[model samples]
Target: EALLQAIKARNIRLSEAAEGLGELFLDGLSTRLSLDGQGRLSWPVLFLYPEYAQSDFISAFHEDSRFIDHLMVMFGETPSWDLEQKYCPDNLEVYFEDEDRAELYRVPAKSTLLQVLQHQRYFVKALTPAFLVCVGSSPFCKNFLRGRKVYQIR
Candidate 1:
């Protein structure tokens, strides 16, 4: 909370939603959700996940691939000095959905997501809202995803 106080100390304004993103980031990082054998957001998974209004954990990460998308959103929406916004307005709308049954939309990002694809993995350890404090974690988050295989999506 000292950080909040410090920011207020500067006669600057801050958003509570952005501060709440910190809680989501820490929660996502510390908590673990069970993925199917393919590391996808499959049912009968683990304990808990992030929730935003009508969306549940499974729906966000597995069904819609909005986990990282919102992470970028939080980063973009949050106030920062050295941090840079990576996802573009046009590219950010690339949403994702199931591949089975029929045709659907897919999304991607320059961070972990490189191209427009249907599905992705939820394994970036440092790709949380809290990690954004490092002043530029997008590159490191990408590198971490590239180097590690345990937490990956197919």
Candidate 2:
């Protein structure tokens, strides 16, 4: 067909693999065979949850709690342009399973994650990468895929 001819003309190499593909490399490598009933990794693995992966991000307003740790909440900056202080949630809860969970909070007059992330991205580029950096998405990726699925090496 025309599509097949075009693909061949462009010299794109396509090969099948026994291992899981892109964005799943670390996920696959860090996969454990004996995940607990709660779905936690059996051993200390190479990867963390997708919500807090190689990137620091807030997926939505609802996920504000999930990213509270990564977020250095702020009230306002000073005239000299410095983070006057970071606003800590009244009560923060850290759960290994629910990293994003935070106590319900009221949005301040100007309280928003937009400012917090903006400053972090601009000023704390290294810090962001230190904790987590979002990877390019794949077609079949999930936050709760608990184990490795290795097929026969082809």
Candidate 3:
């Protein structure tokens, strides 16, 4: 699970990201409760996936399954349906701090846009926008849940 924030590097990149992004945001992931009582390590973390040069064969699990779940993407502004309808949604969450609540969908957090362009190690860039994503659950999702995609309008 990767965080839904903006990243800006003073250097170049493989491609361009969206606009109105922020700096110093949160990016993380939570895990499904494992049967062994041990917290499951979320694999193929959204921003940490192919974005960086970690490992090529880092995909595929022991059972020959993909090493990750869908991602829950939430942000401040709103885009159009073209991006919203992307099958890669995995999961989605829109947090409204004003109302102190969020719109939760039942999908997992998988890959994010960071890795799509290439390794985005923006260590040199200043004022780099950052987003926030955590690996834990909230009261909005107090109990165990299987992430599914849901769409809503305000």
Candidate 4:
């Protein structure tokens, strides 16, 4: 997934193609969820995937600046680059306290981007970006899950 994002990253000739890239501004990504007792869902977290690296792999999750610029292009908003760079990445990773009571977010917390690993320890567990899915219902879901690519998109 990360590679594909990167592959599409250089789509300089065909700009709108980038818009088709998912709006996953949170670099180094993961998904987590919590559910209420009534079987409804809540707190489905989209976090920065844990990355442990020195430099090369570091690019995957830390390109917040570029992601910010790309998103602005996508939505056609042109706030100041300096100002947006300062606040946008922070807003993505942490709290923005001039807070509003109106819920622009469905989750109690804004989407979170995280770094669960760092340095050499992180390198040991490195993985490329990916999506995992199960074709079956819950009882059989785990049985079908595998660390293998089942298909491709273009």
Candidate 5:
């Protein structure tokens, strides 16, 4: 049964021409992609916190959901790793990188996942869209953006 599902997923990926299998292959053979009843695409998304060298995974992030919606829940409470408790949901800065262009795009917290995905320079690698998060006013964020070509999405 599982093998059959995997084959179906592979066919879907081929048809869509998405990048690699992404999080699907992260934990053995499992399909993390799905469509809601309304025919909206739901995806597995990854959020990386470089300052803490940590990551968070969302198995089914809906296309219409705003980044801040999820961040609020994930960072509602101060994480132990954030010793200074500076990673408040409202003070977080989100960014996605275009590795091919060597550019970093800053994403507004109010922007939906679909908006980011539709950007011409943004490509979904490994079938998962990954974004970087940092405290907006922190020195860490300043240092992180120092050498990168950062741009604001239209």
Candidate 6:
């Protein structure tokens, strides 16, 4: 009862959705979720670069930071896998998938992590939030998004 009460006090919506979905998100992870003094929730975030079959994992992404801020730092140097060397922070499109609905949502570069978290259709799966990054003008980006229903968060 105490545990249940604590969870409810922490975040009611998240606790309701996460209950009974055992191990799906915790597979291979040993860290626990935590909160800061200012009551902000930090999350483990994953940035996927399917174009290069690569990914970057951020263990503690603050909810207030914008997507572009992080991208600028991570993509400061061109990655070796970017054969044409065109994956720049300003020329990227970020997306997050709604696995349950088979849909994808576009995240504006200036949007904060909190904005995405509060999205009606977005849920924290695997206890980690994952986003897809693609070069805006590349043919691969076009092919990757083909036949998918992509929407913007309201």
**Against the true structure, what is every candidate's RMSD?**
18.5, 20.2, 17.5, 21.8, 5.5, 4.0
Better of 3 and 6 by TM-score: 6
Output the worst ten-in-a-row residue range by lDDT, candidate 5.
Answer: 10-19
TM-score, cand. 2: 0.18
For residues 98-131, could you state the per-residue lDDT of candidate 3 as single tens digits?
1112323221233232332222231111212122
- lDDT comparison, 5 vs 6, better candidate: 5
**Cα displacement (Å) at residue 77, model 6:** 1.2
In model 5, state the lDDT of residue 1.
33
Q: Estimate each model's TM-score.
A: 0.21, 0.18, 0.17, 0.15, 0.80, 0.81
- Specify the highest-TM-score model's number: 6
Candidate 6 clashes: the total is: 1
Off by over 4 Å in 5: 1-31
Between candidates 1 and 5, the one scoring higher on lDDT is: 5
In candidate 5, what are the lDDT values of residues 1-154, reduced to their tens digit?
Answer: 3432543443333112334444345334333666667556677899999998999999989888999999999998888899889999989999988776789999999999888877767776556778999999998999999989999997
* Ten residues in sequence with the least summed lDDT for candidate 2: 120-129
Q: In model 2, where do residues sit more than 4 Å from their true spots?
A: 1-20, 31-36, 40-83, 90-154
Instruction: Report the lDDT tens digits of candidate 4 across residue range 16-121.
Output: 2224353343233323322335433222212221111111122233321233332233235422432322223223221111112311111112221122111111
Q: What ordering of candidates by TM-score runs from best to worst? A: 6, 5, 1, 2, 3, 4
lDDT of 1 by residue, 1-154 (tens): 3333322232322222224685454444435333445434322111111111112122223422433554455446533332354433332222232223223232233333222222332222232111111212245434423433322233
Comparing candidate 3 with candidate 6, which one achieves the higher lDDT?
6
- Candidate 2, residues 56-146, lDDT tens digits: the string is 2332232122234333342122112212222233322111121223221122223323332222111212111112212213222323322
lDDT of 1: 0.30
Candidate 3, residue 12: how far the Cα is off, in Å: 17
The residue ranges of model 3 lying beyond 4 angstroms of the native Cα positions read: 1-99, 106-109, 113-154
Please tell me which predicted candidate would have the highest lDDT against the true structure: 5
Total clashing pairs for each candidate: 1, 7, 26, 4, 0, 1
